[PDB]
Amino acid sequence: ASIPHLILELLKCEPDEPQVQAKIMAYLQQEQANRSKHEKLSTFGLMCKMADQTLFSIVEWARSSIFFRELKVDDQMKLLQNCWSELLILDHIYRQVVHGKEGSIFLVTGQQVDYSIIASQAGATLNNLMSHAQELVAKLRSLQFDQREFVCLKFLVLFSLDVKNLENFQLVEGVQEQVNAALLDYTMCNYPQQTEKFGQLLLRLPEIRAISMQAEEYLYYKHLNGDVPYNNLLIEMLHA
């Protein structure tokens, strides 16, 4: 376990997985129980609530890093609005790579859900996106995707170089290249069998980005049709 010091500092910002799982599941089915039998939530509304809680967790993880904390709130906002759906999709993909079997989806609540039971309730776009996500899960598991690479990918997504109109763009540039060097060293060291594993890891970022943009546009158009509940962080995210 030869881990660079930067990767350890980045791992130090990882939230407690079982704690957040219990919090999210309790909040979710309690908000359920706070209605009676036929004023209950849709499955789509359940997933919206799950994504909202996961976005809260993403925000509290992002403000857990000094790199992000030392930026002015405007640049923090710009970063998060550029990268929030990408962080969501990447977190789901990593959860599938770790806890997932096959034939089922593992949720942020800690639930193993039958894959066909979910796929039969989703439309064509959501089914295609979930299929592409499972594809990337399989391709990453064939590469032995671990936690440190996942952390560095999170920090690379949070500090994208495509964000314009920033005050401290140089900070984002420096953090980007620091994480690049650290992750490159780590994976080329602890995984010498697959020379190309670093390029293979970096190649999948545009795919998660495109899936993120498609899902974000679908959710925006759906909430403009009223299918997403309110009093939300996801709403304010789409309302931008």
Binding site: V59, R63, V73, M77, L80, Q81, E236, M237
Partner: peptide, 11 residues
């Protein structure tokens, strides 16, 4: 976005 600003300004 005011809710995100509130969250990030909670310090």
């Amino acid at each position: 976005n005011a809710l995100l600003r509130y969250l990030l300004d909670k310090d």
